[PDB]
């Protein structure tokens, strides 16, 4: 491997330290908008709150605690960040014992100015933005009242009482459950599901005997109790609850649960927990109506009701998902699907790695929850086509051994060891740079980076004062070249939070050209087959950045791809026959 020259000089003047020398114990960070560089940092000591604001992607911060009048901010509610570039921020404050209602600091200009607002109620939940209109907010009160605002939280009205759960639907529709006689936990299974399309002026009861409800893609789901039984079933609606269909899914008992694993405009991955405290269930995939379900994966790991699952959307390649399954011997084995759950498969072992014949197993939420030496779950970005990064074990099952970091560049078909120890990682510039920080219980001062998709790595010493590393921060969307390295210095009585923001603009000094990209057929496994690369009835050819090209994709980078319809085979249909949701094959068989 040949390394690019003089990278130290291109990063020293692009390294920016900021110290947060308050006495806080916890730190939370929110990005506000895209292409703004606005970061809000809230530090808490338990109490005192400090509010810091950056507008250069974290290179410099300003103390703006005076903008909230030095009020303690309750971390339970977080920072209610408005969608897209609305620039909306809502912080929930603590009040005294005799206050009639709550207090909230509202900003609509990317945290440049905050307005202090007294509420006619005490908030029980975070204030939720309507996807259709960021001025429309709902919240539940401590008396389980449903409150709605049309003017970004300035004025509130209580549209219904005894509300247990409320969610925005499309076009400013509100769905919510309510109880009549009792409470929310007591009347579990006797709730009613209501809908209002006019922000509380009129109401329609769209369900009774309700356990709970949820939204996923185009689908409205409700679990409904049986008449003379303690079991419950899933009903689904695609017309905002005007009509319902019984999902072709098994019923479950009180000790079981349903969980939406993933949902888009085509279909839903649904987890049905198995009876008993055995920690696993079954994955089913829906049709385009959310009614017909095909069994996709048996013995899917999902510990308890609100427990841990390893289900992972490989967002860098269409149709690819990874998750963990419980073996018959109660060992954990990773499985990968490339066709949206049509079939699952063991992950292919890297060629050079040895078994501790075997396969690759991926560490995710469950491994992290069990306090394994795994700092991050899998990472993928849609604009960085084919790239998957994860901690893994090569062998027969998930192992507690010190895991290596593995990378795929084709969406999970092939794998290679990326780095030796456990590392935090982050993808920048749509894959133009991959960054990694060693996971250690010792202080560190090195950030590793790769410009060839993880094949070659350079180490950069970003500070002479090593830090206990805690996490990476970068602009969501993976289009920036800025990376914030967060850690702390420690004395005998306090911790000094510090961030180092490195700008890679001089590493990727030139913009990528058309010559810098090459054609790549996704899902290619055998060019001799007529249907090579066909997934859900069509294949796609991408323009991928050459690994050898050292250049910036750009903030306005758009993945260039060209689809080609494949002939329909029996693999494109499910049993009602019905074509698979999202399948776009034409001609062929039927
Ligand atoms: C998993 O991740 C992929 C990529 O993020 C999802 O794909 C997209 O679907 C959404 C909404 O349905 C549209 O926002 C995007 O245009 C799609 N993006 C791409 C790159 O395909 C996919 O829907 C997710 N899987 C599931 C089942 O939710
Ligand atoms: C990373 O952060 C830098 C600023 O620290 C970004 O720079 C800016 O460039 C944009 C558009 O060229 C202008 O919005 C801003 O005025 C600049 N910011 C400042 C304060 O100088 C840079 O764009 C980020 N890196 C990437 C690729 O996103
Ligand atoms: C700001 O805080 C000070 C001291 O706590 C208080 O006296 C003042 O009334 C506050 N301003 C408000 C509540 O707007
Ligand atoms: Ca169970
Ligand atoms: Ca490159």
Residue numbers in the entry: 53 to 98, 107 to 416, 424 to 643, 682 to 695
Sentences from the paper on this structure:
Sortilin binds and sorts a broad range of ligands, and dysfunction of sortilin has been linked to a wide range of disorders.
The structures reveal two distinct conformations, a monomer at neutral pH and a dimer at acidic pH. Unmodelled poorly resolved electron density is present in this mouse structure at the well-resolved neurotensin binding site. This additional electron density may correspond to a low occupancy small molecule co-purified from the expression medium, but this has not been modeled. The 10CC-b domain in our mouse monomer structure is partially disordered but adopts a conformation similar to those in the human monomer s-sortilin structures.
